[PDB]
Amino acid sequence: LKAQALAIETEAELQRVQKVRELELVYARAQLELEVSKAQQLAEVEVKKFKQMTEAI
Amino acid sequence: LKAQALAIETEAELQRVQKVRELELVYARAQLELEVSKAQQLAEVEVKKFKQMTEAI
Structure with a gap:
């Protein structure tokens, strides 16, 4: 169950970090x-x- | 039983570390x-x- 919750927080955070990086460049x-x-x-x-x-x- | 829980946390953590590394590069x-x-x-x-x-x- 922890592996599912971690996969969710991983993709949600990486979607944000990717958009922040695209705009900063x-x-x-x-x-x-x-x-x-x-x-x-x-x-x-x-x-x-x-x-x-x-x-x- | 500990070997099963360790294998689950291993694959779950390495899936995160791989995606973080692909984006950081x-x-x-x-x-x-x-x-x-x-x-x-x-x-x-x-x-x-x-x-x-x-x-x-």
């Missing part, structure tokens, strides 16, 4: 894209600033 | 792909910044 991939997009634009700002101040000298 | 492989994807993109940002600042001098 979708969000972490979107948040990664935002962090990379930030780094690409701010790195370009500093390269432009550096090149134009260098061309003045 | 699927998730850890997906999380690895995300960490590598982060490292590849952020390393490209730093390589671009370094090369363009070097070409200015």
Whole structure:
């Protein structure tokens, strides 16, 4: 009887953990894209600033 | 009688451990792909910044 109750709690908990993980990966991939997009634009700002101040000298 | 009860708890517990392990490997492989994807993109940002600042001098 304990093996039946454990099988029920196992599948019920793993259905939750699977859905939480699917959503956290979708969000972490979107948040990664935002962090990379930030780094690409701010790195370009500093390269432009550096090149134009260098061309003045 | 103890050998029967032990065999029942053994198969019941190993059915849980197997399903937990199958899902943890699927998730850890997906999380690895995300960490590598982060490292590849952020390393490209730093390589671009370094090369363009070097070409200015």
